[PDB]
Amino acid sequence: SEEGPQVKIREASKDNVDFILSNVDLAMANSLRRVMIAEIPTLAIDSVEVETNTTVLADEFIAHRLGLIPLQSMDIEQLEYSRDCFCEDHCDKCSVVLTLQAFGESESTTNVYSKDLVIVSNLMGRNIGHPIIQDKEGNGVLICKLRKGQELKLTCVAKKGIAKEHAKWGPAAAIEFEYDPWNKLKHTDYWYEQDSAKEWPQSKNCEYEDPPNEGDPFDYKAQADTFYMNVESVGSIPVDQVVVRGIDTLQKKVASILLALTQM
């Protein structure tokens, strides 16, 4: 295939992908994973204006929860950042507005779910702002629980966001990184009471690579270009799109550096 880094995927899932990166400098791999945590843009609620708060949870608490709730962001690149946009507060191109008013007539406490929550603003033909529910019941993440006789009315303005600006906007929760599983590079020195082999379990990634023969001397020159990584998705952006967007966003930062150099 393509010259340079080559990726063989061990396992696939909508939530997670397991792949092997080959002919990759570790600097770029760690840079990529940090980009996936931070640089990838995703839309979560930035403004919450509540009309009525009968529920015991305070508005700050509920608003933080609402910001945490995942919102679909496949077309978020089509969406323009509110700071980049021209409208004074919110327009349809930059923001997606989600309203929710729940009152509990039931004596039994009525749940408030992410699937309850509905969109006011026009979609404009893009897959943006839909709350994601992986629940088998389809019930959303419960924002609040309502006693009988309690009503909560809120408006949410969700904007494009950066994980470095707030943690909700990060698409991926856990990235698993493995390199030098046999410790041939010996970048780490093990702490063992009697024997290192007993003290530390063998890795699965360890068994993929060949075992080091005890007789061969350590080679200083070798630098590990083979890594074992896994990516887990919240679902606001699909896994493959998250890793491709990590690659693309790193490219965008490098290209920004280059164009700034040309302007200089």
């Binding site: 990235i175 990184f177 020195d189």
Partner: protein, 196 residues
């Protein structure tokens, strides 16, 4: 502060990418220095991290009740069943480098308690402020917006430094400077002086 003796203020907040990461990807919500532990001699903080890791993987609450016979070897054996290291040292990679850290680092679940003391309530600064009338000195307290007391001990430290002008300013111009007129013939400030 932990449920054991050691307490700390947070010196910095670090983003998850910056923080060291295990193969599992778990980032510590908190990082403590290894050096305090030996002088404190609080083994139980370490034991609590180990037991809480074992309990989190087991789903069964760990009993820390005092004078109950426990084996740190036994808890480490349960951790071994989980595959996590018996010592609880977890191999970590530094966030910026992506390089494996040369020394494996202790990683555990530890109960920690938010203390009542918070910086914003403590921080008071006054360049100029309200003055108590009789002393002509500054008022006392942050609510008063008053200046901090210059210690006599602090004054002695400044005399040891030997800087007379700074002490003179802190002692008169910064606090209760006053102009008086005194008669030489009285020897006492009997004079009453109309400048107009």
């Amino acid at each position: 502060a932990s449920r054991h003796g050691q307490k700390g203020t947070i010196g910095i907040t670090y983003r998850r990418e910056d923080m060291p990461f295990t193969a599992e990807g778990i980032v510590p919500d908190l990082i403590i220095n290894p050096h305090a532990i030996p002088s404190r001699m609080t083994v139980a903080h370490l034991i609590e991290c180990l037991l809480s890791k074992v309990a989190a993987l087991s789903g069964n609450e760990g009993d820390a009740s005092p004078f109950t016979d426990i084996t740190v070897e036994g808890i480490s054996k349960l951790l071994r069943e989980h595959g996590y290291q018996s010592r609880g040292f977890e191999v970590m990679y530094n966030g910026h480098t992506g390089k494996k850290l040369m020394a494996q680092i202790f990683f555990g679940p530890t109960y920690y308690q938010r203390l009542r003391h918070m910086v914003d309530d403590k921080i008071h600064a006054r360049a100029r402020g309200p003055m108590q009338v009789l002393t002509r000195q500054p008022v006392e307290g942050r609510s008063r917006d008053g200046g901090l007391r210059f210690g006599e001990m602090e004054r002695d430290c400044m005399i040891a430094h030997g800087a007379a002008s700074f002490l003179k300013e802190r002692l008169m111009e910064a606090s209760d400077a006053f102009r008086v007129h005194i008669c030489g013939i009285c020897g006492l400030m009997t004079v009453i002086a109309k400048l107009n």
